[PDB]
RNA sequence: CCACCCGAGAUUGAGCUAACAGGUCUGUGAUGCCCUUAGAUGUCCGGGGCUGCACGCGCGCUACACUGACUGGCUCAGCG
C-alpha cells in the first residue's frame, strides 16, 4: 500500500479489502472478527516511520469500506492515536493522518464527532508553521468539513488566531457558492 | 471518465495570517479645546400661534356666456 507503483498500491488496497472480507467468513460475529483483523495490524503503528505511515494509510482505506461495522467507540480510539501521530515530524505521517482525519469526518456520525471536535482540532491547531503552510489545502478542506458539520463559531472559538482568517475565508465561499 | 497489459516509473517528492482603492461601518487615546443651579431644546401643565394682510413675484380653481345656462328622459367605461 506504500509501494512505488500505483497499480501495486491499488492491488494491495483491494487485497486488504478482500482479506477483510475473508475474516468475515471465519467466525459468527463480524465485529469481533474485524477487531481481530485490526489487532493483527495494530503493531504497525509502533515500528518504523514509513511503517507508521503505511499503517495509517491502511487504516484510512479500511475505515472507508467497513464504516460502522468495526464499532464507533473503537473508531474514536484510533482517531485519538492519529492525533499523537499528528505530532510527527515526518511529512508523510502528517499527510496520512490528515487523510485519515478527512475520511473519519466523512464517515463518522456527527453526534459522536461532537465529543471529538475539540481534541482532534486542537491537535490540528498546534501543528507547526511549516506544516500549516505546506498542507494548507488539506487543513482548508478539513475546516470546511467541520464548518459544514458543526458550528462555525465553535471552531472559531477553539482555534488560535491565524486559522481564524482561514475559517472566515472558507465562510466567504459560503455566500458566493449560493 | 473507468479498468487492464507492457514498462523501473501511468504520479513520488520540494517550493508556491497578507492585499482590497470590492463595499459597508461609531472601536481604540490616561487625545486638543469649549461649557457644565448660563440644563448645548430639562421633564411637565393650561392657553395662544402655525392660517394673521397694504403690496410684489408665480404655479392652480372658477368664469366672462348663445359653440351658452335651467328643467325632464336616454344609454355608455377603465385603473385600482
The gap between A103 CA and B64 C1' (Å) is: 97
Does A91 contact strand B, using a CB cutoff of 7 Å? yes
Residues 129-148 of A with CB under 7 A from strand B: 130, 133-134
Does A21 contact strand B, using a CB cutoff of 7 Å? no
Cβ within 8 Å of residue A158, ≥6 positions away:
A117, A118, A121, A122, A125
Question: Are the CB atoms for A63 and A99 separated by under 8 Å?
Answer: no
Experiment type: cryo-EM
Task: With both helix axes pointing from N to C terminus, report the angle between A117-125 and A136-149 in degrees, rounded to the nearest 10.
Answer: 160
Does A4 contact strand B, using a CB cutoff of 7 Å? yes
How many Å apart are CA A142 and CA A120, to the nearest integer?
A: 11
How many Å apart are CA A128 and CA A126, to the nearest integer?
A: 6
- Can you read off the three cell numbers belonging to residue A23? 475474516
The DSSP string of chain A is ---SSHHHHHHHHHHHHHHHHHTTSSSS-HHHHHHHHHHTTGGGGTS-HHHHHHHHHHHHHHHHHSTTTT-HHHHHHHHHHHHHGGG-SSHHHHHHHHHHHHHHHHHS-HHHHTTTHHHHHHHHHTS-HHHHHHTHHHHHHHHHHHHHHS-HHHHHHHS-HHHHHHHHHHHHHHHH--
Amino acid at each position: 500500500t506504500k509501494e512505488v507503483s500505483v497499480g501495486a498500491r491499488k492491488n494491495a488496497f483491494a487485497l486488504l479489502v478482500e482479506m477483510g472480507h475473508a475474516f468475515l467468513r471465519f467466525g459468527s460475529n463480524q465485529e469481533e472478527a474485524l477487531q481481530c483483523y485490526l489487532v493483527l495490524i495494530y503493531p504497525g503503528l509502533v515500528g518504523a516511520v514509513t511503517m507508521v505511515s503505511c499503517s495509517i494509510l491502511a487504516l484510512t482505506h479500511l475505515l472507508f469500506e467497513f464504516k460502522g461495522l468495526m464499532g464507533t467507540s473503537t473508531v474514536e480510539q484510533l482517531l485519538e492515536n492519529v492525533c499523537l501521530l499528528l505530532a510527527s515530524r515526518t511529512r508523510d505521517v502528517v499527510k496520512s493522518a490528515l487523510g485519515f482525519i478527512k475520511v473519519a469526518v466523512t464517515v463518522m456520525d456527527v453526534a459522536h464527532l461532537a465529543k471529538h471536535v475539540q481534541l482532534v482540532m486542537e491537535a490540528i491547531g498546534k501543528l507547526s508553521d511549516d506544516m500549516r503552510r505546506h498542507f494548507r489545502m488539506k487543513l482548508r478542506n478539513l475546516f470546511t468539513k467541520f464548518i459544514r458539520k458543526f458550528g462555525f463559531e465553535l471552531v472559531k472559538r477553539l482555534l488560535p488566531e491565524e486559522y481564524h482568517r482561514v475559517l472566515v475565508n472558507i465562510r466567504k465561499a459560503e455566500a458566493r457558492a449560493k
